[PDB]
Symmetry: D2
Subunit: 115 residues, 4 copies
Amino acid sequence: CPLMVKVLDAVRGSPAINVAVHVFRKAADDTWEPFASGKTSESGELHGLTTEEEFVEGIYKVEIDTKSYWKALGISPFHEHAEVVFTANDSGPRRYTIAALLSPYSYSTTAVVTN
Amino acid sequence: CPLMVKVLDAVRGSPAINVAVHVFRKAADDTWEPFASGKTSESGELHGLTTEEEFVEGIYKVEIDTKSYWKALGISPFHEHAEVVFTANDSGPRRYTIAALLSPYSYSTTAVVTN
Amino acid sequence: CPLMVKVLDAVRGSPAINVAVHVFRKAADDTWEPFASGKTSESGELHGLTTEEEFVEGIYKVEIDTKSYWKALGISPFHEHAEVVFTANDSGPRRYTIAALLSPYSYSTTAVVTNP
Amino acid sequence: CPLMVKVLDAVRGSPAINVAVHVFRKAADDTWEPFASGKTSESGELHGLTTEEEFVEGIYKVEIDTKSYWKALGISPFHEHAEVVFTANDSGPRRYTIAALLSPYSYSTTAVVTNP
Ligand SMILES: *S(=O)(=O)c1cccc(-c2nnc(-c3cc(Cl)c(O)c(Cl)c3)o2)c1
Ligand SMILES: *S(=O)(=O)c1cccc(-c2nnc(-c3cc(Cl)c(O)c(Cl)c3)o2)c1
């Protein structure tokens, strides 16, 4: 609800289905603690990662397992994973969507932050 | 229904609202004939452009009026408009979403073609 | 020097070589006049399209023939071409680099504009 | 020569100058070891990070300090940094260019990989 991930495939023109996504929260000692994870749906989306109560301000990392995705399609890719690192800020709008558009040697990512 | 346009703003991290979009179909003589138009909604989307009956195979152009968008925000942009030119093909999946992610001096565009 | 085009392939992780590029300029009657054309090199770059004398103020369209590129590679892409339309030189001469990063169903484009 | 980083600004239409870049390499114990670092030049380019001797096979992370860039411009961006993680040189030495195109709430990144 407060956090959604959307993943698209630029080679096939389709949602990127069954992609593993792992979310981490930065701890006090600067290590990354597991926070949430799942796999994208048939629409390329992963909902239900967290709740408003748990998603407090801090630094988060969303790791999208792109290498496995491309390998399953028989395509050799560049990156190990796509990484998106950001601060959640209570001032700003309350719903974060992290989107990524994937190619074998490239990716784009954007944030849609709305109320 | 068969054609949707989605426009996002990479400067503000938000849907690009009230952006004019014009769709053209290539005519026999190679001119561009007006086909559909509208303005993006509060979610950055423009639905209802065409129907399955009218959206036959052919070459289409989607022109997104980015310059006016940026000017209304007080930002000086590079492009006159973003252009997306493609062939609609009956073989492939039946629903086309044309997405564009806008910055003042850059844009990205992708197609999500699904059934 | 005043206008350069750079094209990259996001599938291969390489320059996009032998990509045809056509530039047009909008005339006073609002039609698109052919202005220049060429092909990217083995570096993905196309230089020598125009001269500072010829490249006057106007609205220019840079058409990058992406479908022909992907088809010559045996691949069926979505777009016909990538089109970049911009006003040039309206505060005096500038140098423009138009870059594009290509995938079969997507592309990104940017401009680097510098003042000599 | 073996590793180059190029950064562009999608807001300004310019190179992204004075962008800090940190490269790490994954150690055998699975931690990220500092490998090299530098700043982009007035061309948006960072050269001289490593040597072909030093740049052995491994998993490398290129951290581009985008937040610091946008903040030094007085702008409040979304991301902390742009991170590019890849296996390098696992079929022998290659030359890698890592490119990034930056906006306040978005970035794109690509790689050009060539065989000397
Ligand atoms: S919307 O939720 O209906 C919707 C439909 C289709 C596509 C999108 C979407 N979300 N993000 C993107 C996108 C992200 C990036 Cl990083 C880039 O470069 C592009 Cl071109 C699109 O598309 C939303
Ligand atoms: S080259 O040095 O002459 C050159 C000039 C201008 C721009 C480039 C360049 N390199 N990469 C890119 C680029 C990267 C990405 Cl990730 C995206 O999305 C785009 Cl549109 C361009 O541009 C090289």
